[PDB]
Amino acid sequence: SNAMNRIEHYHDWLRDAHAMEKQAESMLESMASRIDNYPELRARIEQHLSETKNQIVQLETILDRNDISRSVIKDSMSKMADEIVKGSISGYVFEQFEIACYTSLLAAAKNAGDTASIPTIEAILNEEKHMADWLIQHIPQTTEKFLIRSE
Amino acid sequence: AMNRIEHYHDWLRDAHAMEKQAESMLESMASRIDNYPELRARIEQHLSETKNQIVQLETILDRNDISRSVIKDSEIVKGSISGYVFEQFEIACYTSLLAAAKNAGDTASIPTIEAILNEEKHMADWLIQHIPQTTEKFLIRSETD
Numbered sequence: 001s002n003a004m005n006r007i008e009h010y011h012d013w014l015r016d017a018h019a020m021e022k023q024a025e026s027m028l029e030s031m032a033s034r035i036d037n038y039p040e041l042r043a044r045i046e047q048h049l050s051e052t053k054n055q056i057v058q059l060e061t062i063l064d065r066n067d068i069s070r071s072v073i074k075d076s077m078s079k080m081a082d083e084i085v086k087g088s089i090s091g092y093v094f095e096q097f098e099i100a101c102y103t104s105l106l107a108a109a110k111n112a113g114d115t116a117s118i119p120t121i122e123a124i125l126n127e128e129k130h131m132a133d134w135l136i137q138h139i140p141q142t143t144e145k146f147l148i149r150s151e
Numbered sequence: 152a153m154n155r156i157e158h159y160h161d162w163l164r165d166a167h168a169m170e171k172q173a174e175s176m177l178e179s180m181a182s183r184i185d186n187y188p189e190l191r192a193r194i195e196q197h198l199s200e201t202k203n204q205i206v207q208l209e210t211i212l213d214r215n216d217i218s219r220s221v222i223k224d225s226e227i228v229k230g231s232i233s234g235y236v237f238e239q240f241e242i243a244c245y246t247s248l249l250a251a252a253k254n255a256g257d258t259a260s261i262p263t264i265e266a267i268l269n270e271e272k273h274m275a276d277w278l279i280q281h282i283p284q285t286t287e288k289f290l291i292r293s294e295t296d
């Protein structure tokens with residue numbers, strides 16, 4: 001037996017989530033800088049970048065509550081880890097990764113007893129769901145625009 | 152209108168390559184799930200669904216007079232997350248493919264693509280609904296072992 005293995009897993013996933021948000025922040029900045037001629041899509045990506053910068057700040061508060069720090073290695077490795085249509089699809093898929101990871105993290109925080117952090121995790125998760133919903137709603141419009149312009 | 156139809160054809164070929172990736176991923180996942188009978192069973196049911204999705208895409212390819220692209224074709228917590236993300240990639244790709252089929256006027260294929268999309272949505276749903284249980288099970292095991 002070692003009960004402390006559960007807490008080690010929780011702390012590892014908190015560090016994973018922090019690294020994931022660094023990856024998101026890089027991805028969103030890159031996408032925004034590259035998009036031309038899709039004003040709504042670009043602006044929503046720019047808004048989510050702002051949201052993601054705050055998600056990092058919020059995760060750092062959770063790390064602090066648990067008396068741990070980010071992994072600099074993981075933060076760095078996560079930053080190493082047709083186009084408008086494919087890129088929209090890619091963006092959606094990354095938000096769904098975030099959704100899955102935060103859903104798992106809610107269960108982990110519950111298991112660990114870190115009740116005080118659950119409403120922050122929920123706040124983040126709700127922002128990812130809102131972004132994923134926006135994107136999947138706009139994918140058909142984007143696909144139509146792309147096809148119209150291909151002619 | 153030829154460029155639009157070509158894009159739609161390219162994306163049909165992309166979807167067919169994707170479903171071969173899925174078939175491979177599902178088999179590999181079924182073999183690695185050792186502590187969630189209900190999850191492995193869901194995955195096995197989806198693998199069967201996926202083999203049929205490939206046959207349906209093959210009918211759509213034929214009806215559009217195209218062929219698959221040869222070149223394009225050829226732990227448990229992180230695994231469940233990865234499976235979910237792959238179903239979500241399929242959801243996003245079929246959401247786009249539906250819009251493309253409507254634009255290109257391959258209206259005949261809409262019901263088959265919609266059927267595929269609803270399968271993917273059901274699998275994604277099962278997965279996220281059960282990620283909390285998978286996580287709890289994993290954590291308990293990590294202590295017990």
Ligand SMILES: [Cl-]
Nearest residue numbers: 038039040041
């Ligand atoms: Cl737009």
Ligand SMILES: [Fe+3]
Nearest residue numbers: 095098128131
């Ligand atoms: Fe996000």
Ligand SMILES: [Fe+3]
Nearest residue numbers: 238241271274
């Ligand atoms: Fe699937």
Ligand SMILES: [Mg+2]
Nearest residue numbers: 024052055098
């Ligand atoms: Mg995020």
Ligand SMILES: [Mg+2]
Nearest residue numbers: 170173204241
């Ligand atoms: Mg599929």
